[PDB]
């Protein structure tokens, strides 16, 4: 009875503190910046071989190798320059939802509705790809996973928690609690010190890896958050939701900066990604196409309209010379 | 090109051949999703994710039981959905109706037909004969309900269980008729814990669904 009033007072204190710093907006300081103009991108490669909907995609660090997952139960590694296939990995369960590529290029991980994260070894003396370890402990389905090094990995699940794992022993070292709904997306900072998670409670949190405590909590969306991306400098969020809205958050001003929306868009958002310089923001929609946004102006610079179904995957290379998309029509396309 | 590129191309072609070979076998199995609440008797209808397999007339089926707002998106390619309701517990029929309404109107399931099982008829019949609990205590509209003249009761059944069974079936069907516009159909069935013919009903309903899809494909409907 007494703690609710204290919580309300603290929330009012935070709200009053945030309003005091809103001395300007992005839409006013950018009046002296020229528009990017019209951006045209065309398909350079088409990747065929999948027989079902594609759910996940991730680039390598060399900007040539690519890994993709589909509901047919197989994991494919592509050579983007020649369209040749490098490996084909059968899965023990066909209900896969995420995949990842190790920064050293030696391991790949995946998971889904089986509540298990599995790690595969790509460089063996026998010539075959084999499973190295299975990570168990979650109670819900697995929604996203990302490598930190060859021995550390972070996972997010639908049981409202996130975890940090030790691949050598298979034991969970830190558990992150504080969400009230299913956790959808993760994004790892360039300095490998903080990470961000979105959830179905329409909130975003910043986590400290080294201590396991939540540092900041952001709100504003009216529905579930589907994707989260990390601006290159380490000080911004990019989030997408099912209410057809994208928002930009800052970790130092601790509030929202700019909103990306349009009256003709009434579908959800599935993926968000940035360019190298951060000027362009890429987003996937259920309207069977992908839109290109100007991050500093909330305008529309272009559109990619080559798919015949929902867009589920989106990624950008480390050198910035290509963009890859994945859809439910069983096709992959490389844009430039 | 270099010789190593030719060998890589040969390896890629072999990988493509092996991928194509695997797809043919997968296409011969029909996939089903099982949904229902506790006490409904899901586990007995055909006796992270639980799986089961059965075969009728040289056709293979694969049924999945998960454990709903998020993971339902990945089951939009299944042939049909099976829903089980306990028809001998009046306190919880509104929960079942709300769940059925929430499933029927889901935006990702607009093209999937539903096979509806109304289970545990014997307990309902015993309770109706006993007269220790009345439907009118929970559904006031039942007092004005009359059995249709086109009813086909099973021989030997007292004309007090048919009224209740048809009232429940009408209550479930009326939701399905309010929306759908012909894109999917409901197939009501009455079952019990001891019935064994349940396998044939799924086979017939799936054959009918595929027939409807074929009719739509040839510009006949």
């Amino acid at each position, epitope marked *: 009875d007494q703690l609710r009033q204290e919580a309300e007072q603290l929330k009012n204190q935070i709200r009053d503190a945030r309003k005091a710093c809103a001395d300007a907006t992005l839409s006013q300081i950018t009046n002296n910046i020229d528009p990017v103009g019209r951006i045209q991108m065309r398909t350079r490669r088409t990747l065929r071989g999948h027989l079902a909907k594609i759910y996940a995609m991730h680039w390598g660090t060399d900007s*040539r*190798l690519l890994v993709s997952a589909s509901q047919d139960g197989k994991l494919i590694i592509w*050579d983007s320059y020649t369209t*040749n296939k*490098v490996h084909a990995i059968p899965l023990r369960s066909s209900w896969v939802m995420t995949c990842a590529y190790a920064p050293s290029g030696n391991y790949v991980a995946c998971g889904g509705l089986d509540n298990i994260c599995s790690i595969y070894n790509l460089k063996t*003396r*026998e*010539g*075959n790809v084999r499973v190295s370890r299975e990570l168990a402990g979650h109670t819900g389905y697995l929604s996203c996973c990302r490598f930190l090094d060859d021995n550390q990995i972070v996972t997010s699940s639908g049981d409202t928690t996130c975890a940090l794992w030790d691949i050598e022993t298979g034991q969970q070292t830190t558990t992150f609690t504080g969400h009230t709904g299913d956790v959808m997306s993760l994004s790892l900072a360039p300095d490998t010190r903080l990470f961000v998670s979105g959830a179905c409670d329409a909130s975003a949190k910043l986590w400290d890896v080294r201590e396991g405590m939540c540092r900041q909590t952001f709100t504003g969306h009216e529905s579930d958050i589907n994707a989260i991306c990390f601006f290159p400098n380490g000080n911004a969020f990019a989030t997408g939701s099912d209410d057809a809205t994208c928002r930009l958050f800052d970790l130092r001003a601790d509030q929202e900066l700019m909103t990306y929306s349009h009256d003709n868009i009434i579908c959800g958002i599935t993926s968000v990604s940035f360019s190298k310089s951060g000027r362009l923001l890429l987003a996937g929609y259920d309207d069977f196409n992908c839109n290109v946004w100007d991050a500093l102006k909330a305008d529309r610079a272009g559109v990619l309209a080559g798919h015949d179904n929902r867009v589920s995957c989106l990624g950008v290379t480390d050198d910035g010379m290509a963009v890859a998309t994945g859809s439910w029509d069983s096709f992959l396309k490389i844009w430039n | *090109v*270099s*010789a*190593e*590129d*030719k*060998a*890589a191309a*040969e*390896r890629s072609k*072999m990988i493509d051949k092996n991928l194509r070979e695997d797809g043919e076998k997968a296409r011969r199995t029909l996939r089903l999703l099982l949904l229902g609440a506790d006490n409904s008797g899901k586990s007995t209808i055909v006796k992270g994710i639980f799986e089961t397999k059965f075969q009728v007339d040289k056709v293979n089926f694969h049924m999945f039981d998960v454990g709903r707002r998020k993971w339902i998106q990945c089951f939009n390619d299944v042939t049909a959905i099976i829903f089980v309701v306990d028809s001998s517990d009046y306190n919880r029929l509104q929960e079942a109706l709300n769940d059925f309404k929430s499933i029927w109107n889901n935006r990702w399931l607009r093209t999937i037909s539903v096979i509806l099982f109304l289970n545990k008829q014997d307990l309902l019949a015993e309770k109706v004969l006993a007269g220790k609990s009345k439907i009118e205590d929970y559904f006031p509209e039942f007092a004005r309900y009359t059995t249709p003249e086109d009813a086909t009761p099973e021989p030997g059944e007292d004309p007090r269980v048919t009224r209740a069974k048809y009232f429940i079936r009408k209550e479930f069907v009326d939701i399905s008729t309010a929306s759908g516009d012909g894109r999917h159909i409901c197939y009501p069935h009455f079952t019990c814990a001891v019935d064994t013919e349940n396998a044939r009903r799924i086979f017939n309903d799936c054959k009918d669904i595929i027939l409807q899809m074929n009719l739509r494909e040839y510009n006949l409907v």
Partner: single-chain antibody
Amino acid sequence: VQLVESGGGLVQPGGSRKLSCSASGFAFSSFGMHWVRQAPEKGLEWVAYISSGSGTIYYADTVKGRFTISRDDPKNTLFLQMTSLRSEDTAMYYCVRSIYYYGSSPFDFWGQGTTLTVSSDIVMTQATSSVPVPGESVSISCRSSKSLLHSNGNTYLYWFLQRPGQSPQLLIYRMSNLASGVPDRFSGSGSGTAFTLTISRLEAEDVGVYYCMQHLEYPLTFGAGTKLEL
């Protein structure tokens, strides 16, 4: 990972014999296979190549019409059929494993070998018979008749080391890539038609003959061989 060869013996001119190789410890069906011949006073010579799927087959210009290579995946065995043998065929025969994709190491493992007793090409040039020489730096050079730099950015030069009584071992592939299990004392560099091999500090295990090989076009060609005497 183990390859064992069988067959061999003494034959008369005009006869025939069949060789075999038994493989174990790896996915035999995913690898391509080669046969390499070494004469007592000639060095290494390539004979034939068979693909993993039996798709493509190549032969040397001195064995066409007389040698036949075959594969048996369910039994994990290799075969080489030889007819109308001549005096020039007396030599040691080796079996070599190869796999081809982006980033692979196509000449990583060599067999042990068997002995047989009877009774346009790119020229790879080495010229030094013996380099006398622990703890000192040694440089070995190779020179080719035609450039090995392809338009895709790759240069196809390979280095091998043969210790006394041992099979050749891979050190460097594609001129800069150190093979697995090799100590970091080895390095290599070059450009165009001139290549060098550098050893930072010699040990007692660095005594043997070093060979150069190109992989631009068939047939595959070897160098004369450079002997390092400690």
